[PDB]
Amino acid sequence: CTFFEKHHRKWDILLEKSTGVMEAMKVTSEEKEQLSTAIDRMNEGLDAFIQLYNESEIDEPLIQLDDDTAELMKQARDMYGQEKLNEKLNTIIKQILSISVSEEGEKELVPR
Numbered sequence: 863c864t865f866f867e868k869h870h871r872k873w874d875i876l877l878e879k880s881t882g883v884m885e886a887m888k889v890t891s892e893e894k895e896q897l898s899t900a901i902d903r904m905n906e907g908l909d910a911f912i913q914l915y916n917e918s919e920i921d922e923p924l925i926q927l928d929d930d931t932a933e934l935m936k937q938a939r940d941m942y943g944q945e946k947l948n949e950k951l952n953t954i955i956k957q958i959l960s961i962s963v964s965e966e967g968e969k970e971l972v973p974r
Contacts, residue, residue: 867922869903874919876927877931881929881938881945896947896954898948916966925966933954951964 863871879887880899909929911919920927929936935955938944944951964970 869907870919870922871913873915874922874924874931876907876924877919877934881934884946891951892947896945900954900958902964904958906962908948908958908961912961912963912966916962918963918965929960932940932964971972 863869863875865871876899880896881888887899890898915921916932917927920930922930924930925933935944939948939951939955942948942962944955947954960969
């Protein structure tokens, strides 16, 4: 992202800055810090990166891909909800997770 990669390390930057700092990008307005950030890069960044990865950032050698990101949205969605906005995040995450970014795994393994 800041070295060589472009978006390959950006999606992780948006997921690492959005709900990976809890202020560096979580205290931008809350509603705008989740939406603006859910569209900022998640817009074409997700639709793109996803169309390039569709694993949640697997290509990127970090841990795997599931925890690489899931661990982020998990710790948040398990600690507060995703960014302390669960109230509205549930939709922001459900949207940025149902948009087919989670892992294009039928929404998430099993729907029902």
